[PDB]
Design an enzyme around this catalytic site. Structure first.
Site, mmCIF file in Angstrom:
data_model
loop_
_atom_site.group_PDB
_atom_site.id
_atom_site.type_symbol
_atom_site.label_atom_id
_atom_site.label_comp_id
_atom_site.label_asym_id
_atom_site.label_seq_id
_atom_site.Cartn_x
_atom_site.Cartn_y
_atom_site.Cartn_z
ATOM 1 N N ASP A 1 0.823 -1.201 0.000
ATOM 2 C CA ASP A 1 0.000 0.000 0.000
ATOM 3 C C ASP A 1 0.863 1.260 0.000
ATOM 4 O OD1 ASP A 1 -1.948 1.936 0.412
ATOM 5 O OD2 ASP A 1 -2.281 1.406 2.509
ATOM 6 N N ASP B 1 -2.205 5.423 -5.091
ATOM 7 C CA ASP B 1 -2.483 4.515 -3.969
ATOM 8 C C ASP B 1 -2.669 3.068 -4.437
ATOM 9 O OD1 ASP B 1 -3.186 3.240 -1.636
ATOM 10 O OD2 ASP B 1 -4.818 4.612 -1.170
#
Ligand SMILES: COCCCCn1c(C(=O)N(CC(C)C)[C@@H]2CNC[C@H](C(=O)N3CCOCC3)C2)nc2ccccc21
Ligand SMILES: *[C@@H]1O[C@H](CO)[C@@H](O)[C@H](O)[C@H]1NC(C)=O
Length: 332
Positions: A35, A218
């Site tokens: 992430d 992201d």
């Protein structure tokens, strides 16, 4: 150094991309999202009360089965835009793509069923900067960099459109999964994988982000997101219906939907309807979900757009820590 290494990812339904890491001696295996939108490592803990059903269904790290465990016990809470986990800090050896690193990570003891019963992954490996790390815990990529094994201070993401689910290259990129040149865009600032955006267009009409806005790249997000007000305008332009958690169109209208372009670093990054519609039918009587939704991210990170797996599927993404920039190339 000279090493490049890779983590092979699984693609669950084009919405969750995760790889496997080992934690402890002997290694306990976890499925984890890598992430770039966060900077902490965590996995569910054997200390998680089993009243959290998500801890019943996920793999739990048991410190009491690891001979390389080092207790810390500082309590921390990680507030994501989609939910919250809490627990405490521990240290152990983490194996990630054949690289072993001593890493401080969260043992999650509180793991809400919504949303975490909907996670195919067990935990998260934050690929963001130490500036974003809760408790200022050294992120894993910083710890990997400190070993001097990687040929470059960079990592790259390939997310497959077929649900090889994907691949992260630590220390470079993989020319097998991109083509043409990288377009390199500088970060607004060190500390967040966020770039300037200067327009979101539907067809030829730049109806959003006219004065500029932020785009977080992201890798841990499924969709493209923007603020509620931004997304409501976008969806009004597409003729999409708002539901509780997603926007939809009649499935027959899916292929008629216009291109959406994101003006990044002087170029138009264009998603067609095929890139953002879950085209599960062509019926006028079924609804098809769009891979775009509202996420209101508070300051200082937001308000911001976020370019998740929907974007990354089309654009192979290199994250360059040496130069504080993100490179995009056409994925293949
Ligand atoms: C591409 O494959 C992975 C897709 C995971 C999408 N997904 C998220 C999710 O989108 N996130 C968390 C998770 C990584 C914990 C994102 C990851 N990036 C960080 C963001 C975030 O919290 N912010 C707020 C601070 O600014 C950056 C964006 C949450 N939550 C979920 C819960 C259950 C099931 C799926 C979930
Ligand atoms: C936990 O880590 C912090 C920061 O490194 C350290 O100061 C603290 O003493 C550690 N606590 C324990 C109980 O080991």
């Amino acid at each position: 150094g000279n090493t490049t290494s890779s983590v092979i990812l699984t693609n669950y339904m084009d919405t969750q991309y995760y790889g496997e890491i080992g934690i402890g001696t002997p290694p306990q295996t976890f499925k984890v999202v890598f992430d770039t939108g966060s900077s902490n490592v965590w996995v569910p803990s054997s200390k998680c009360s089993r009243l959290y059903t998500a801890c019943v269904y996920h793999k739990l790290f048991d410190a009491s089965d690891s001979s390389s465990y080092k207790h810390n016990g500082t309590e921390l809470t990680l507030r994501y835009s989609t939910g919250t986990v809490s627990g405490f800090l521990s240290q152990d050896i983490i194996t990630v793509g054949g690289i072993t690193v001593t890493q401080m990570f969260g043992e999650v003891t509180e793991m809400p069923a919504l949303p975490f019963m909907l996670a195919e992954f067990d935990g998260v490996v934050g690929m963001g900067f130490i500036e974003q790390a809760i408790g200022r815990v050294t992120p894993i990529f910083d710890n990997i960099i400190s070993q001097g094994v990687l040929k470059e201070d960079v990592f790259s993401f390939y997310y497959n459109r077929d649900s090889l689910g994907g691949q992260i290259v630590l220390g470079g990129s993989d020319p097998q999964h991109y083509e043409g040149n990288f377009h390199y865009i500088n970060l607004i600032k060190t500390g967040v994988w966020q770039i300037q955006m200067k327009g979101v267009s539907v067809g030829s009409s730049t109806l959003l982000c006219e004065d500029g806005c932020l785009a977080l790249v992201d890798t841990g997000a499924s969709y493209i997101s923007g603020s509620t007000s931004s997304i409501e305008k976008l969806m009004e332009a597409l003729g999409a219906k708002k539901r509780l958690f997603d926007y939809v169109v009649k499935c027959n209208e899916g292929p008629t939907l216009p291109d959406i372009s994101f003006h990044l670093g002087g170029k138009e990054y264009t998603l067609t309807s095929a890139d953002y519609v879950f085209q599960e039918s062509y019926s006028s009587k079924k609804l098809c979900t769009l891979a775009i939704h509202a996420m209101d991210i508070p300051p200082p990170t937001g308000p911001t757009w976020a370019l998740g797996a929907t974007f990354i599927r089309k654009f192979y993404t290199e994250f360059d820590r040496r130069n504080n920039r993100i490179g995009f190339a056409l994925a293949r």
